[PDB]
Amino acid sequence: MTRLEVLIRPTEQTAAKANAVGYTHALTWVWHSQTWDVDSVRDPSLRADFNPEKVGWVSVSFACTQCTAHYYTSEQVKYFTNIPPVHFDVVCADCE
Amino acid sequence: MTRLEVLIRPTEQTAAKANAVGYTHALTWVWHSQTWDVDSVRDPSLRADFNPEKVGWVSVSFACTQCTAHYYTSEQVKYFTNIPPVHFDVVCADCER
Ligand SMILES: [Zn+2]
Ligand SMILES: [Zn+2]
Ligand SMILES: [Zn+2]
Numbered sequence: 001m002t003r004l005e006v007l008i009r010p011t012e013q014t015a016a017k018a019n020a021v022g023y024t025h026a027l028t029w030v031w032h033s034q035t036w037d038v039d040s041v042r043d044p045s046l047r048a049d050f051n052p053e054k055v056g057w058v059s060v061s062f063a064c065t066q067c068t069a070h071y072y073t074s075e076q077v078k079y080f081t082n083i084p085p086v087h088f089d090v091v092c093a094d095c096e
Numbered sequence: 097m098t099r100l101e102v103l104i105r106p107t108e109q110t111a112a113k114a115n116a117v118g119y120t121h122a123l124t125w126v127w128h129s130q131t132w133d134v135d136s137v138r139d140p141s142l143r144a145d146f147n148p149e150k151v152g153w154v155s156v157s158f159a160c161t162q163c164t165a166h167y168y169t170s171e172q173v174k175y176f177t178n179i180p181p182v183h184f185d186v187v188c189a190d191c192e193r
Contacts (some may be wrong), residue, residue, distance in 0.1 A: 001126075028165060031127045033170060073167075075097060076130050081125065 004030045005043040006058055008080050010050040018050035019056050028058055033071055036062050041092040048080040056081040064092035098132070100168035101125045101139040102154055104176050106146040114146035122176055124154060126169045132158050136186045146155040152177040 008026040010018040018024050033043075041062070048056065059074040069092045077083060104122040106114040114120055129139075144152065146149070153171040165188045173179060 030168075034172070071168075073169075074129060 001031045002037050002062065004032060004041065006030055006060070006086070007043070007045045008048050008058065008077060008083060009045070010080075011047045011073050014050035017052070021052055022048070023079060024051070025078055028075050028077055030058070030060050030073055030075060032060075032062060032071055032073065033052050035064075035091075035093050036071065036088065037093055038090055038096065041088050046084055046085050046086070048077075048083040050079055053078065053080050054081045056083045058083045058086070060086040060088070062088045062090070064095055065089055066091055066095040069094070098123040098128055098130075099125050100128060100137070100156065101107045102156070102175060102182065103141045104154070104172075104179060105138070105142070105188070106176075107143045107191055110146035115176045117148065119146070119175060122173050124152075124171050124173050126156050126171055127156050128158060128167060128169070131165055131188050131190070132167065132184065132186070134186055134192060137184050142180050142182070144173075144176040146174060146175060147177045150175065153177040154182065156180045156182040156184070157166050158186070158188075159187055160191055162187055165190070 062071040159166040
């Protein structure tokens, strides 16, 4: 399977806190299959609220725009919360 | 991010052909989140039909018996086909507690 890299950095609201502890980005790998290797699936760069007391979830959903093929995956991210959800509504590998 | 390894070896009815070409097993893997880091989720070992011209899917499903947490992944495996579906019907990490 293929990996997608997700970059998460602080919202402006939490940037001072994140810089104070010295923790200014998270990088998360998300795995998916060949179905979803397509040009429209690009590595996301997200903004979320840094909080050294919390653990948030990054969720990435894939859905084909022609067929009914879909996939959902989610991973924990230490110290970031209110991570926006990622959606790839694309033409799948096969449908292309 | 936890790797789950899946070992696939030939059924009795296909093992001779697999030995003939010297391809005795496939080791594949999928990934799952912290939700499914529980004792009853363990690397499976499966028997499937060796076939020299096919590519099969192995599917791995997770579902909690207490809440409705669930997860489905799959991976392609060269030369093995009719791979048994793997099902982890378990108590998830949130429901353990
Ligand atoms: Zn499609
Ligand atoms: Zn689903
Ligand atoms: Zn549960």
